[PDB]
Amino acid sequence: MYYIAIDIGGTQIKSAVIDKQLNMFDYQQISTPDNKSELITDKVYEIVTGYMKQYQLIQPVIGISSAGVVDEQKGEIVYAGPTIPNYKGTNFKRLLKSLSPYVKVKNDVNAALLGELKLHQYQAERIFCMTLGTGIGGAYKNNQGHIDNGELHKANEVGYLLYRPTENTTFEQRAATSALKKRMIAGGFTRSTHVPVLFEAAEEGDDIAKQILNEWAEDVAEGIAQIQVMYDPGLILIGGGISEQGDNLIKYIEPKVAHYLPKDYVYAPIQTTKSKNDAALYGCLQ
Amino acid sequence: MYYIAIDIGGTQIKSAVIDKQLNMFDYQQISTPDNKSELITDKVYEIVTGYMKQYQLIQPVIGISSAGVVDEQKGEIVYAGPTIPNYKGTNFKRLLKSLSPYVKVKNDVNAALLGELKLHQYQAERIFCMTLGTGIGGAYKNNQGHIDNGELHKANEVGYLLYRPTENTTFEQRAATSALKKRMIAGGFTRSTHVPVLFEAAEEGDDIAKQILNEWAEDVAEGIAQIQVMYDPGLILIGGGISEQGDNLIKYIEPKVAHYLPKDYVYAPIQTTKSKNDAALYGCLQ
Ligand SMILES: CC(=O)N[C@@H]1[C@@H](O)[C@H](O)[C@@H](CO)O[C@H]1O
Ligand SMILES: CC(=O)N[C@@H]1[C@@H](O)[C@H](O)[C@@H](CO)O[C@H]1O
Numbered sequence: 334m335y336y337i338a339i340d341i342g343g344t345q346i347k348s349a350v351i352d353k354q355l356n357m358f359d360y361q362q363i364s365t366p367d368n369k370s371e372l373i374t375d376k377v378y379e380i381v382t383g384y385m386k387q388y389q390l391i392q393p394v395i396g397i398s399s400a401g402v403v404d405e406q407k408g409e410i411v412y413a414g415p416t417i418p419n420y421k422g423t424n425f426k427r428l429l430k431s432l433s434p435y436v437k438v439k440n441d442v443n444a445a446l447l448g449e450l451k452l453h454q455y456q457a458e459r460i461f462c463m464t465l466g467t468g469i470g471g472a473y474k475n476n477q478g479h480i481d482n483g484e485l486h487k488a489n490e491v492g493y494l495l496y497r498p499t500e501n502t503t504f505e506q507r508a509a510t511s512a513l514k515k516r517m518i519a520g521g522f523t524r525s526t527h528v529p530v531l532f533e534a535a536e537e538g539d540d541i542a543k544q545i546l547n548e549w550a551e552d553v554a555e556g557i558a559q560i561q562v563m564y565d566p567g568l569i570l571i572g573g574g575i576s577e578q579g580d581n582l583i584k585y586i587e588p589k590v591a592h593y594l595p596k597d598y599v600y601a602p603i604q605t606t607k608s609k610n611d612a613a614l615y616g617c618l619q
Numbered sequence: 620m621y622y623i624a625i626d627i628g629g630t631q632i633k634s635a636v637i638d639k640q641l642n643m644f645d646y647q648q649i650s651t652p653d654n655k656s657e658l659i660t661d662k663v664y665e666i667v668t669g670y671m672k673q674y675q676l677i678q679p680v681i682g683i684s685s686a687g688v689v690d691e692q693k694g695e696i697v698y699a700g701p702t703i704p705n706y707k708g709t710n711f712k713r714l715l716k717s718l719s720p721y722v723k724v725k726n727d728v729n730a731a732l733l734g735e736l737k738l739h740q741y742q743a744e745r746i747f748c749m750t751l752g753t754g755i756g757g758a759y760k761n762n763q764g765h766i767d768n769g770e771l772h773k774a775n776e777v778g779y780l781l782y783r784p785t786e787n788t789t790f791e792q793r794a795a796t797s798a799l800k801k802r803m804i805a806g807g808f809t810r811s812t813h814v815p816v817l818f819e820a821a822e823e824g825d826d827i828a829k830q831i832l833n834e835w836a837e838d839v840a841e842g843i844a845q846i847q848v849m850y851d852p853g854l855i856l857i858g859g860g861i862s863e864q865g866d867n868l869i870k871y872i873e874p875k876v877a878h879y880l881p882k883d884y885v886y887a888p889i890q891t892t893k894s895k896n897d898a899a900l901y902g903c904l905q
Contacts, residue, residue, distance in 0.1 A: 356813045361631075362648050364669065383650060527644055 337384045338614040339377055340398040341365070342441060343416035343467035344510075344574075346373070348380045349614050350388060355451070357611060359384065368418050374428050381432055392433040396617030397425045398444035400468055402487045408438040411486055414505070416467055439617050442470040442489065443480055445572045445606065448616030450474065453607040457567025461489075461560055462606070465553065466573035468492055469505045473564055494556050504556040510574075513549055520545035532578055550585035557586065558593030561600045569603045572612065576605040623670045624900040625663055626684040627651070628727060629702035629753035630860075632659070634666045635900050636674065641738065643897060645670065654705050660714050667718055678719040682903030683711045684730035686754060688773045694724040697772055700791075702753055723903060728756035728775065729766055730902030731858045731892065736760065737901045739893045743853025747775075747846055748892070751839065752859035754778050755791040759850055780845050793838040796861050799831075806831040818864055836871035843872065844879030847886045858892040865891045 340347040342365065349360045366376050381395060401413035401420055408426030426436045439447075446462040458476045463469065471489035474480050482488050492505025506512055510528065517531055521541050524534055535542035557569060575582055587603045594600055606612060620639035625632065634647040652662050667681060687699035687706055694712030712722045725733075732748035744762045749755065757775035760766050768774050778791025792798060796814060803817055808831055810820060820828035843855060861868055873889045880886055892898055 352811070352813070354811070354816070356811065356816055358813055359650060360648065361650060362646060364645060364647060364673070387650065525638075525642075527638075527642060530640075530642060 335388055335390055336394045336618045337381055338396045338617050339380055340613040342400050347614060350384055381429055394435045395429060395433055397438040398441050398613035398617035400441045403438050403440040404486050408436055441613055442472040444613035444616030446472040446474055447619040448612035449606045449608050451615050455568055459566040460568045461564050461566045462570045462572055463491060464572035465575050466510055468509050494559050507552045516549055517545055532581055546585050551589055553586050554589030555593050557590050566601050569601050570606050572606045577609050579605050621674050621676055622680045622904045623667055624682045624903050625666055626899040628686050636670050654703055667715060678721060680721045681715055681719050683724045684727050684899035684903035686727045689724055689726040690772050691725060694722055725903050727899055728758035730899035732758045732760055733905040734898030734902030735892045735894055741854055745852040746854045747850050747852040748856040748858055750859035751861045752796045754795050780842050790842040794842055799835050802835055803831050818867055832871050837875050839872050840875030841879050843876045852887045855887050855889045856892050862891040863895050
């Protein structure tokens, strides 16, 4: 009993102690260090030792969910995009090799998917999870219940989909939070800089907010269409902080998916994840 | 806009940036430093500068909610219980003077009540708020909308109520959330040390868990009865971490309050707070 879980993303580092029965205690959310004067490895070390002293844990099982391409066996970040500077090469097993030899590392979306499936039951046999946020990532659980990470650990890096040579942009470069916030300013949305306010303003009938959301949702849908064509999944789950919007998110994306598929093509239902925040923390220990 | 809000408790320090429209962003929640080799002052300073850098805020309006007797004018902790060691004398106005002259400091319950009333409207003219958690605190907003803190700032230190000389224990020593954890252990509840698990177990028919909850609720009700008698409030709000149990906590307490009142005595409705986690973060800026 008493596992330590840490979920690292470009915006926040989340942590908690989880028991054998899936009960979460001592949740701790902090703004991600810049990885320049403040180090993610130092913050991760501090979180582990804090939980160790707090609960007198000897060689505890530590689970690590992280953005970036993850080599599970190595416990290492083999490639990272630009969101987290100087991240490539980060090895968590070596970092904590004095506190515990029991360290697991997974990609953020694999963790989110395993977590969501640990907490909620679905009829669908094939489930693809796509998270929207700082970055766009993916994970697929097949009919035999297996998640394939790829020959080089980079399966489902869906942010790399749909490179437009004339715009020099990937899916991620048009649909991640930093891109949407730039689209809000370009769209004429001066009201706020926060995505929830954009959603709120659109619910109130602000035409401006709606045009930004619909155009952005057009690109999200295009990416989902490619995922659908390839996997033919029973269910597509949308994860990430924006998952909080629920049906107010689905209503903008879901209908648009049909624009990139043939008229009689049946695609999977598109839904937000039921677990809106702690999914990856449970997933990294699975 | 952009106000910095920090809520310091014996268990955790929560922080967030809040805008003019009451939108909460960059929420953070860390375990409370031990205040020995790790200082709360340093962490608060660290949290404020971090938000200043992230948003390029100059002399930002800073709000501080804290457990302990608070001298609002001085912005200082005048007395603290045995929860946070070396807390007495902590002065937040002085500590943050190098960053902003706009600092406000309040007791955690005053902040909770002001916070809950800022996000939720009630018909009741007089509202008492009691929080259950690491300790037990209280606050009273009268029919004139004013909260009287007392001649020596210790008004509504409700944890000192009902001292029992045969047991050498106060209300706070029998009804504090951590007193409930001690009671679960002494009552033979080995299944877990997590209070929500005691609630789950009782819902599923665990008689030992039901007994621990009813005995504990009896002492909570007793304290509420004294508060009701003095104030005759229009509403009693229950805040604190245990407030997340909502109606499942109320069903244990409300009926029992009548046991310490006369047969035809009408007491106020007792409800959990609506803003469960962040009430104090909104309240400390009022
Ligand atoms: C190369 C890289 O960094 N890819 C990450 C991916 O691992 C992660 O799943 C996703 C969501 O956080 O964000 C991408 O940018
Ligand atoms: C003397 C003292 O510290 N009293 C605190 C009180 O200020 C606080 O409101 C309450 C809830 O946290 O806990 C009590 O123990």
